[PDB]
CSV table of C-alpha atoms and ligand atoms in Angstrom, one decimal:
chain,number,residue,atom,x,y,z
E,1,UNK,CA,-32.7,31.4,15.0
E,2,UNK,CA,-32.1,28.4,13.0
E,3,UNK,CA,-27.8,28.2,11.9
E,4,UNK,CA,-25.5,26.0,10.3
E,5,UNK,CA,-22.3,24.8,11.3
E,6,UNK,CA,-21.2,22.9,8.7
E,7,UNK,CA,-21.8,20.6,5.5
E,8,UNK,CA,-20.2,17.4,4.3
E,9,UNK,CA,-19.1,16.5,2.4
E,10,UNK,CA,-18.5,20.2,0.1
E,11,UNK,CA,-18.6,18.5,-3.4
E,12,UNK,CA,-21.0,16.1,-5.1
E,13,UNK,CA,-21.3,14.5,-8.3
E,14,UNK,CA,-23.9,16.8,-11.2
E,15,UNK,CA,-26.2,13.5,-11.5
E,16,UNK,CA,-26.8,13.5,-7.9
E,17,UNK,CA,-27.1,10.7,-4.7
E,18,UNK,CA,-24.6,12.7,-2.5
E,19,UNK,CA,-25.8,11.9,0.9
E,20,UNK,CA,-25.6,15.8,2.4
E,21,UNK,CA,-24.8,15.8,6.1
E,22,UNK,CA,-26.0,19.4,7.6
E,23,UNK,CA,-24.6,19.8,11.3
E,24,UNK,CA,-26.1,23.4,12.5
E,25,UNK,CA,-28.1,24.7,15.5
E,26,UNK,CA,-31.8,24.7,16.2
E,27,UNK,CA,-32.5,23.0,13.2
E,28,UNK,CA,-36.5,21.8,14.0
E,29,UNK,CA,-37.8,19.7,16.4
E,30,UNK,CA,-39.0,16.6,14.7
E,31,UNK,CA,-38.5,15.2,11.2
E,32,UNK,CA,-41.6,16.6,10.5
E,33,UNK,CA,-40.3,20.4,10.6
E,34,UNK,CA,-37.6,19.8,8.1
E,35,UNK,CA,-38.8,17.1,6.1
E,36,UNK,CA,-39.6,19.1,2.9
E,37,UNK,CA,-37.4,22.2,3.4
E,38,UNK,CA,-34.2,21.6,2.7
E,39,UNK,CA,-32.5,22.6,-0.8
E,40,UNK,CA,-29.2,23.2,-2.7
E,41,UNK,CA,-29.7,25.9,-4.8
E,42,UNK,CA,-33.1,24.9,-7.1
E,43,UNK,CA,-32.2,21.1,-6.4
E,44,UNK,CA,-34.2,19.0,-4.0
E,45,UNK,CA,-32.0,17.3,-1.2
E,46,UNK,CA,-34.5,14.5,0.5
E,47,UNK,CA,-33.9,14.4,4.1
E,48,UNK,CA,-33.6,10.8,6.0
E,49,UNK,CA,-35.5,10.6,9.0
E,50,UNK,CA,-32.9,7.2,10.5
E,51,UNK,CA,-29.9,9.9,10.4
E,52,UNK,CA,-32.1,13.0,11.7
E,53,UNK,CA,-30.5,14.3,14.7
E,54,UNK,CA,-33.3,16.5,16.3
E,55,UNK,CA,-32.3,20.3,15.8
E,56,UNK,CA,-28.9,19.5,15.3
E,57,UNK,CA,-28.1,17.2,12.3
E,58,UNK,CA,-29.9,17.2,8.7
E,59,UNK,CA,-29.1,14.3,6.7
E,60,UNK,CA,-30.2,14.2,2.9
E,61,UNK,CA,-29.9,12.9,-0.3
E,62,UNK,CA,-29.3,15.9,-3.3
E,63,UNK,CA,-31.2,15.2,-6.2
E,64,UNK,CA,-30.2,15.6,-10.0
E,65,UNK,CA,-28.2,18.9,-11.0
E,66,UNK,CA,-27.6,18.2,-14.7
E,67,UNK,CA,-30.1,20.7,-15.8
E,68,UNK,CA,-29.0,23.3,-13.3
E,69,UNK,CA,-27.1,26.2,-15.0
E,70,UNK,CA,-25.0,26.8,-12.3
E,71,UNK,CA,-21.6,25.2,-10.6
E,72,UNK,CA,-22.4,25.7,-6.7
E,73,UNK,CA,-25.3,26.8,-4.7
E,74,UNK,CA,-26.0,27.7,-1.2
E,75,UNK,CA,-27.8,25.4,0.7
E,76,UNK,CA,-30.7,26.3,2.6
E,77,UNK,CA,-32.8,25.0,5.4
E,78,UNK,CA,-36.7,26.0,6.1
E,79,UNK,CA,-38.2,25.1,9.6
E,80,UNK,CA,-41.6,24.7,9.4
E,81,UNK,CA,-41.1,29.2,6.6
E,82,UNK,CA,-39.9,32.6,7.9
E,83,UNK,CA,-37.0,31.1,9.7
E,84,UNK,CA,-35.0,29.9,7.3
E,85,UNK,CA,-31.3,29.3,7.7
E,86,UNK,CA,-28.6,29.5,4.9
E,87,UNK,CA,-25.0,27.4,4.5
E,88,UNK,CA,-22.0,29.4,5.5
E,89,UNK,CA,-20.3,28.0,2.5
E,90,UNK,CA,-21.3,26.7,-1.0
E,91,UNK,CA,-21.5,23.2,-1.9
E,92,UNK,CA,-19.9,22.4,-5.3
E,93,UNK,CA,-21.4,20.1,-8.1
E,94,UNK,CA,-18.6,19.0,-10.4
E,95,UNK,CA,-17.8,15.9,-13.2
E,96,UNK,CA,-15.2,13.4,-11.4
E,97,UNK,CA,-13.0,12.4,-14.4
E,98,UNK,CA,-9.9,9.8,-14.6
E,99,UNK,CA,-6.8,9.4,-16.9
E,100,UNK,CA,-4.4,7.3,-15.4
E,101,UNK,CA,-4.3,4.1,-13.2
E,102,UNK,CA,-0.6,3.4,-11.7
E,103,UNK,CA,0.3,0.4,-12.0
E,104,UNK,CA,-1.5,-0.1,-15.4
E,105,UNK,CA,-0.5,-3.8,-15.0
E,106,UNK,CA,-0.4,-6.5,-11.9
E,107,UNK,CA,-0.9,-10.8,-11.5
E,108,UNK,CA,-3.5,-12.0,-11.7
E,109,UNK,CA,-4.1,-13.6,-8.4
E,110,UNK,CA,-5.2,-9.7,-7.4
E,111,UNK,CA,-3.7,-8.0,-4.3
E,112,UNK,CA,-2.1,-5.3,-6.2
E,113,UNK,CA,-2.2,-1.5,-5.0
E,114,UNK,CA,-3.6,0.9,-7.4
E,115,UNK,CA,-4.1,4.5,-7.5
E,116,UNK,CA,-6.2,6.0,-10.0
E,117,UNK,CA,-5.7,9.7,-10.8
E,118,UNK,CA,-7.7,12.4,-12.1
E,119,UNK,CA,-10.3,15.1,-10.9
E,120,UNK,CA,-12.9,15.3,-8.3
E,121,UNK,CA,-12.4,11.8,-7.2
E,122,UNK,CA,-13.2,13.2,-4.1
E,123,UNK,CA,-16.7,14.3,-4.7
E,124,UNK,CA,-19.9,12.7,-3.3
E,125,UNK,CA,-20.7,10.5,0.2
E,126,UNK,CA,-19.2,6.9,-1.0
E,127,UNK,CA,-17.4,5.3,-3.8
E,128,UNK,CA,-16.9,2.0,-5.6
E,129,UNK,CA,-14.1,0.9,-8.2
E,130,UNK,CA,-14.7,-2.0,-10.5
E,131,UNK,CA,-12.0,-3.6,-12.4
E,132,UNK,CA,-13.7,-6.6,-15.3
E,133,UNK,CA,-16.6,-6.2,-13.1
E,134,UNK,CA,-15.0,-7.0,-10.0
E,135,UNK,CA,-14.7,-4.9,-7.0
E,136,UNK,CA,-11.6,-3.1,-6.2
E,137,UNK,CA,-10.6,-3.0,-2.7
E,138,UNK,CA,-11.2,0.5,-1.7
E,139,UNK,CA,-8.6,2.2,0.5
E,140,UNK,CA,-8.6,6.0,0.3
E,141,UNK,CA,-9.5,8.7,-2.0
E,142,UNK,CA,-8.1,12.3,-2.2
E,143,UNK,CA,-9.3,15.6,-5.2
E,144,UNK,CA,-6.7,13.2,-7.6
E,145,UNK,CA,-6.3,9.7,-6.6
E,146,UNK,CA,-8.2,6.8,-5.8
E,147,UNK,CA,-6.5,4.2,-3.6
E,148,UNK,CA,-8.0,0.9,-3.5
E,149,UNK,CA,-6.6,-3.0,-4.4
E,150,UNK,CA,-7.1,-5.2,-7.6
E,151,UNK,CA,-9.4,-8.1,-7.0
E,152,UNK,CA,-8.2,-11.6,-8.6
E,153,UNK,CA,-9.1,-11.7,-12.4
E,154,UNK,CA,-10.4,-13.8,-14.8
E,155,UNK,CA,-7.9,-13.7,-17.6
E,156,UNK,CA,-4.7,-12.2,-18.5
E,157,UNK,CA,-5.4,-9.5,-20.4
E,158,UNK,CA,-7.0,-6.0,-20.6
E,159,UNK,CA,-9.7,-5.2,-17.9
E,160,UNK,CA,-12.3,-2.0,-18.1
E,161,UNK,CA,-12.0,0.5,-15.0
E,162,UNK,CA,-14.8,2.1,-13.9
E,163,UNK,CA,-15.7,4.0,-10.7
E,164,UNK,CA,-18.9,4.5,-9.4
E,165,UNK,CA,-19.6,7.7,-7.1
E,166,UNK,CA,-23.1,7.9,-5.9
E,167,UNK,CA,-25.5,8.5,-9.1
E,168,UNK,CA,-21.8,8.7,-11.4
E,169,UNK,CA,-20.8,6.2,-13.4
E,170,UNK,CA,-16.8,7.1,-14.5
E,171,UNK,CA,-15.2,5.1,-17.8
E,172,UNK,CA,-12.9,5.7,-19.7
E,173,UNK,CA,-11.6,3.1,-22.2
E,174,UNK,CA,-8.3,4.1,-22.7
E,175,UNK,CA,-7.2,3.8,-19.1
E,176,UNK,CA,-7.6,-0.5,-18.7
E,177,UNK,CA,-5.7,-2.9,-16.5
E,178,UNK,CA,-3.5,-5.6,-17.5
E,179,UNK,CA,-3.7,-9.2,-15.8
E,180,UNK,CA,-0.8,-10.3,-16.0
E,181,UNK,CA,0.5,-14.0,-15.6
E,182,UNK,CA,1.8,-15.0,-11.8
E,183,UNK,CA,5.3,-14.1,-11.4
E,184,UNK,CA,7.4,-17.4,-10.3
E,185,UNK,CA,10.3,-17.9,-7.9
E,186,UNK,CA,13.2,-20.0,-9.5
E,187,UNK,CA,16.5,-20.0,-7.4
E,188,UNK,CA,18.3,-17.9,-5.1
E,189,UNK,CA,21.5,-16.8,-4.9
E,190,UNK,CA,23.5,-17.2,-2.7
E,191,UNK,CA,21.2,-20.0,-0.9
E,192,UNK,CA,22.4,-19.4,2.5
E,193,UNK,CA,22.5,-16.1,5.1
E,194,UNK,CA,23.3,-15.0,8.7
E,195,UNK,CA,21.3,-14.8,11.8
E,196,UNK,CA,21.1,-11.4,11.4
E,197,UNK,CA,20.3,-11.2,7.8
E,198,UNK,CA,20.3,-7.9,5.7
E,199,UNK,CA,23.0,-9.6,2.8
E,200,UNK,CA,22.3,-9.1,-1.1
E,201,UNK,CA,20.0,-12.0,-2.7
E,202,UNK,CA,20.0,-12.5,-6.4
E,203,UNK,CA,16.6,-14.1,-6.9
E,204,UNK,CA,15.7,-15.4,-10.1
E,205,UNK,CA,12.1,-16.2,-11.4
E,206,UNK,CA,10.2,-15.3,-14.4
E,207,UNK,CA,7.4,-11.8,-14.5
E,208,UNK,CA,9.1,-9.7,-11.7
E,209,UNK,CA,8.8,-6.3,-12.8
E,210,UNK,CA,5.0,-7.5,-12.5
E,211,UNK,CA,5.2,-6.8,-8.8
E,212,UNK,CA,6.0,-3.2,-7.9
E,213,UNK,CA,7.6,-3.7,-3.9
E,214,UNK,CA,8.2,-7.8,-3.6
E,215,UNK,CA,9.1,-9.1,-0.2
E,216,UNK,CA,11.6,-11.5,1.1
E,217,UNK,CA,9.7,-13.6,4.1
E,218,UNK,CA,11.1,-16.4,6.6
E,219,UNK,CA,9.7,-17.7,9.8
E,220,UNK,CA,12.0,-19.3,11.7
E,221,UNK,CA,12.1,-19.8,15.7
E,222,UNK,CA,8.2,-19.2,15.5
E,223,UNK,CA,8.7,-15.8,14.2
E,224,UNK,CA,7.7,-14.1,10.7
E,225,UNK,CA,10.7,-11.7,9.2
E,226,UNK,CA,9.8,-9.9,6.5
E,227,UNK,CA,12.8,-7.4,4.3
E,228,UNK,CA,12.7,-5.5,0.8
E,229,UNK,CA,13.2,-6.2,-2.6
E,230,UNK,CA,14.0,-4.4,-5.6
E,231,UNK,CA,13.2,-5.4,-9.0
E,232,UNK,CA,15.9,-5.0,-12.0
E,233,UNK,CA,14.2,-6.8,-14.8
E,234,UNK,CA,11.5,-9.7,-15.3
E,235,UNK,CA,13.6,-12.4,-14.2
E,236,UNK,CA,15.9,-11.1,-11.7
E,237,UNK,CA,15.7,-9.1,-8.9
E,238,UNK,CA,18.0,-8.1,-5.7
E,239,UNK,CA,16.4,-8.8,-1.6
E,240,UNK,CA,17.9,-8.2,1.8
E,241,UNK,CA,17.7,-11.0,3.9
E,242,UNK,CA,15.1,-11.2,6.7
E,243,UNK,CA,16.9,-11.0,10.1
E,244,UNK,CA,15.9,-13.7,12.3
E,245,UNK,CA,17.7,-12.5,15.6
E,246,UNK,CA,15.4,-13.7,18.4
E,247,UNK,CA,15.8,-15.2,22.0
E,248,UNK,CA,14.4,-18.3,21.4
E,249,UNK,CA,17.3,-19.9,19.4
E,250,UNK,CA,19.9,-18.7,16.7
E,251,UNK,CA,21.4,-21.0,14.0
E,252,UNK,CA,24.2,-23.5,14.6
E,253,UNK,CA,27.6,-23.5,12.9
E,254,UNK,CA,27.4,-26.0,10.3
E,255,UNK,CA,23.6,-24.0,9.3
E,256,UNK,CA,19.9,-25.2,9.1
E,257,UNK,CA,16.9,-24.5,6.9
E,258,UNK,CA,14.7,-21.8,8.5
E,259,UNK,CA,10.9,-23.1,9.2
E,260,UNK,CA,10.0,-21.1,6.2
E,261,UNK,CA,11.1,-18.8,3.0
E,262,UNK,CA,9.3,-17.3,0.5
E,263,UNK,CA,8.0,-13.9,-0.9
E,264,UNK,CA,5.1,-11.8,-0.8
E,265,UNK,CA,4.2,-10.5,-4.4
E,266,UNK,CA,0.7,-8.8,-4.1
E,267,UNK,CA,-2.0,-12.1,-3.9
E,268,UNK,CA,0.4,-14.6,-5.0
E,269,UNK,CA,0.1,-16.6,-2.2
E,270,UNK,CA,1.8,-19.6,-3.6
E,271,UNK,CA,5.5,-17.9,-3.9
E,272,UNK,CA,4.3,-17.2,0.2
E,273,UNK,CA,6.6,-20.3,1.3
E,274,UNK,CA,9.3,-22.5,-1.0
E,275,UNK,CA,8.8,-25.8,0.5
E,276,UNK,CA,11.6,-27.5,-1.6
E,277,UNK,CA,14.3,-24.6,-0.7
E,278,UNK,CA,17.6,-25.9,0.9
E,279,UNK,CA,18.1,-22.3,2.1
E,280,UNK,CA,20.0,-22.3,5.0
E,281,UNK,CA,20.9,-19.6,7.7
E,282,UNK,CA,24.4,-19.4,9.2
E,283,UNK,CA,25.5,-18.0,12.6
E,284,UNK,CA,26.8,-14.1,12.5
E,285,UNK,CA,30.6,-13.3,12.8
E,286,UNK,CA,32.0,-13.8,15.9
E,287,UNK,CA,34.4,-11.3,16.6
E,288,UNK,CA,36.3,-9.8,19.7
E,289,UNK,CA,38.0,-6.4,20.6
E,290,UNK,CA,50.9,-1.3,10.9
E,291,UNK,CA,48.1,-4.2,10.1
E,292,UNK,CA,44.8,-5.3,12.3
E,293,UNK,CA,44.3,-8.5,13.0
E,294,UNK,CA,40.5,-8.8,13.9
E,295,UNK,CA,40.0,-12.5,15.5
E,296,UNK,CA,36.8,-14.7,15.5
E,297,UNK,CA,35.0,-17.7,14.1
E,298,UNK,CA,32.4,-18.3,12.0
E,299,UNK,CA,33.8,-15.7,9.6
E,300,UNK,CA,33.9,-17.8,6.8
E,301,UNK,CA,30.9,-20.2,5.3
E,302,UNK,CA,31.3,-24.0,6.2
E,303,UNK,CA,30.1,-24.7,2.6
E,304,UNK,CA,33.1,-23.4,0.5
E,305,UNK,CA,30.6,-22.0,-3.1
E,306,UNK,CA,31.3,-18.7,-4.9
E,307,UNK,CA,30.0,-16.8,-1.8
E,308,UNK,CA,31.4,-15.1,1.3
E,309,UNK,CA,29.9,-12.4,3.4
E,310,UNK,CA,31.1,-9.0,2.3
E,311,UNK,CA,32.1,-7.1,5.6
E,312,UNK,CA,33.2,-4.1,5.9
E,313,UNK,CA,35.4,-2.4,8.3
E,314,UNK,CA,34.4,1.1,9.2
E,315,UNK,CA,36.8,2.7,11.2
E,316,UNK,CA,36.7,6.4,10.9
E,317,UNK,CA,33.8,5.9,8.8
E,318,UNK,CA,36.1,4.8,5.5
E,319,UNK,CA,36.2,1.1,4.3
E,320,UNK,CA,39.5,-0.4,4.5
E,321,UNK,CA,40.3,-3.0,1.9
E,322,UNK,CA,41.0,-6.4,3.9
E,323,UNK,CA,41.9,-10.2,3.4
E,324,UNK,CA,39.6,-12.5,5.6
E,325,UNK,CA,40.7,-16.3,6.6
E,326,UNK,CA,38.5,-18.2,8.7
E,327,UNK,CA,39.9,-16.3,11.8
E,328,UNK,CA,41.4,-13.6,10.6
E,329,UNK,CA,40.1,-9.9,9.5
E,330,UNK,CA,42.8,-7.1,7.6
E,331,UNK,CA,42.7,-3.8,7.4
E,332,UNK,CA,45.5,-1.7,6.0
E,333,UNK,CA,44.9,2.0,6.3
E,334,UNK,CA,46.7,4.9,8.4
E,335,UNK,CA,32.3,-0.5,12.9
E,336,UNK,CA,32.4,-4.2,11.2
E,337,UNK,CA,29.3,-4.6,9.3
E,338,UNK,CA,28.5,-7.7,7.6
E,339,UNK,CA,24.6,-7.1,6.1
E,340,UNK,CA,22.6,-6.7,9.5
E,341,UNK,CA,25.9,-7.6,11.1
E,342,UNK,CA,27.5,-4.9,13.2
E,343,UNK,CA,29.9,-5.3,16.0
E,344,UNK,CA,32.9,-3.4,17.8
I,1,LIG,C1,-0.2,-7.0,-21.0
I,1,LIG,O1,1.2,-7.2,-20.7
I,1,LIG,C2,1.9,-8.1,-21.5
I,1,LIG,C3,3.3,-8.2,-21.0
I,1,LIG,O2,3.3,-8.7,-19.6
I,1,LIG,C4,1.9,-7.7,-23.0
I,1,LIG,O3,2.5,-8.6,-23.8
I,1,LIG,C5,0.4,-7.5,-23.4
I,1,LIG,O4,0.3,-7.0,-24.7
I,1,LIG,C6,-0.3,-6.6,-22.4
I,1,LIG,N1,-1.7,-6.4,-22.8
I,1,LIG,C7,-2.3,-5.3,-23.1
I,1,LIG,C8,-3.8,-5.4,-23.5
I,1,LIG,O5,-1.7,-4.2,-23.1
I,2,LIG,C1,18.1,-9.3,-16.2
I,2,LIG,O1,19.4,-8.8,-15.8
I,2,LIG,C2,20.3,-9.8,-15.4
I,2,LIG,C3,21.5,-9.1,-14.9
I,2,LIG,O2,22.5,-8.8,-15.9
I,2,LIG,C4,20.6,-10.6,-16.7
I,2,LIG,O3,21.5,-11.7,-16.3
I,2,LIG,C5,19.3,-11.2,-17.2
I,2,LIG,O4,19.6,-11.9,-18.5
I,2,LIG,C6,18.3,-10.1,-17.5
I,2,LIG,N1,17.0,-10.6,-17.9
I,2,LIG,C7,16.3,-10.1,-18.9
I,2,LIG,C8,15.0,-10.8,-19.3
I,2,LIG,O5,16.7,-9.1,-19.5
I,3,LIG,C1,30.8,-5.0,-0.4
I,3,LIG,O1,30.7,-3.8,0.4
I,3,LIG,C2,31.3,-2.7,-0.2
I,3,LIG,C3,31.1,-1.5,0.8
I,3,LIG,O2,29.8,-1.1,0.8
I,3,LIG,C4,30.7,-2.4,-1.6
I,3,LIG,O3,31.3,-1.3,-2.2
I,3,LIG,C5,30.8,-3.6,-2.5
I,3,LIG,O4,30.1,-3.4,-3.7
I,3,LIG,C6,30.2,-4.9,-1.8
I,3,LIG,N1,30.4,-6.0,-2.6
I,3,LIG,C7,29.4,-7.0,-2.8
I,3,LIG,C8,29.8,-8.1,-3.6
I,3,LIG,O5,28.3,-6.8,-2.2
């Protein structure tokens, strides 16, 4: 008379704790019925009377397995002792292991995303990851990876993992994280964009390839823009400007600094807005519908430097090599897109 539906989770740790949830039918009455009959293989699995759902859930902790000679066990339920009901499918004890944690480094201000691989990290009812004794973040978990993120450390320097999974206690000393010092923002070049952004920025600064994905930010016309970076070495790296294209209001001709710029680098919260930066935000081209002569204004950049947008014609879907004046656009061959920029 008594059945079960179904167990979670399927595996569990060999040293035990795994909080067994049982969801079946007719399975008792009170707590009383089931209190003292429930079992996974030859190990004991304490029922708890809070999460007792009367003839329908079982909830209970497994006891130790590391003296059981065996790898999985059914699990059976006694109510009352002749009727008896038995798992449809085995629940698995098995030794979570780790080799690897990816990024192996990150700054020390914390925020960075790690995923730990290796086996069973799935196992058990709950999970904690510790990095120099502080609590990582948890996120997910799959079979072979833990997701969670880095707290802020102490010290640069090598950190011990270790990952706790109910009555488990994972280590392994040659898998540590390195704190490493706070990446810093020195220039950028060029210092100025368009309204609607997307251009290449060379930014300088010093521990870079610290950060795996680094942000561009500004917040300008009471919005927050955010674009993407890549990182080439420690102390350079390439972002697309943050389009600020909004309703509210758009830059004038001769430029003006956006309410703020910055970067988001994992925790660094510091590099979060540049309150010194003269970075300035220019309108986008203006332009209007055997050479081509493609009119408009605010082609060029009022502050003549060593930078000019790069635009690019793309008629039939081919870039067509072109001289640009302050009003005048060139192509010479037998759709403009200036970063963000696009226009017909
Ligand atoms: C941490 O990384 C730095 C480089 O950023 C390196 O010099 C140092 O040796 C590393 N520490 C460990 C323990 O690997
Ligand atoms: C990073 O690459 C840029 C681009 O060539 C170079 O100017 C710079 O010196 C490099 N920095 C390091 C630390 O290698
Ligand atoms: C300008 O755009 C063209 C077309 O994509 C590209 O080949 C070229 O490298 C760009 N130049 C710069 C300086 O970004």
């Amino acid at each position: 008379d008594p059945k079960i539906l179904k167990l979670s989770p399927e595996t569990g740790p060999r040293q035990g704790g795994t909080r067994l949830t049982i969801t079946g039918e007719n399975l008792g009455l009170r707590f009383e019925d089931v209190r003292l009959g429930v079992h996974v293989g030859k190990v004991l699995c304490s029922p708890v009377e809070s999460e007792y759902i009367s003839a329908e859930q079982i909830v209970c902790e497994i006891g130790d397995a590391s003296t059981l000679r065996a790898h999985d066990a059914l699990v059976e339920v006694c109510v009352r002792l002749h009727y008896r009901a038995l798992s449809p499918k085995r629940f698995t004890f098995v030794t979570p292991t780790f080799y690897r944690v990816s990024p192996s480094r990150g700054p020390l201000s914390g925020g960075t995303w790690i995923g730990i691989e290796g086996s069973h990290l799935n196992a058990g009812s709950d999970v904690a990851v510790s990095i120099g004794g502080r609590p990582c973040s948890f996120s997910w978990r799959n079979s072979r990876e833990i997701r969670c993120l880095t707290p802020p450390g102490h010290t640069p320097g090598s950190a011990p993992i270790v990952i706790n999974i109910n009555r488990a206690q994972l280590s392994n000393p040659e898998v540590k994280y390195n704190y490493t010092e706070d990446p810093t923002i020195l220039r950028i070049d060029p210092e100025w964009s368009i309204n609607s952004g997307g251009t290449l920025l060379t930014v300088t600064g010093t521990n870079l390839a610290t950060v795996r994905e680094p942000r561009i930010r500004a917040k300008y016309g009471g919005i927050e823009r955010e674009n993407s970076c890549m990182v080439y070495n420690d102390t350079t790296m390439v972002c697309r400007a943050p389009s600020i294209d909004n309703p509210k209001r758009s830059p004038p001709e001769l430029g003006e600094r956006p309410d703020e710029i910055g970067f988001i680098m994992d925790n660094v919260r510091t590099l979060l807005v540049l309150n010194s930066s003269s970075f300035l935000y220019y309108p986008d081209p203006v332009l209007e519908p055997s050479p081509l002569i493609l009119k408009g204004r605010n082609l060029l950049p009022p502050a003549p430097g060593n930078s000019r947008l790069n635009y690019t014609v793309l008629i039939g879907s081919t870039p067509c090599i072109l001289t640009v004046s302050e009003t005048q656009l060139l192509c010479e061959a037998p759709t403009v897109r200036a970063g963000g920029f696009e226009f017909s």
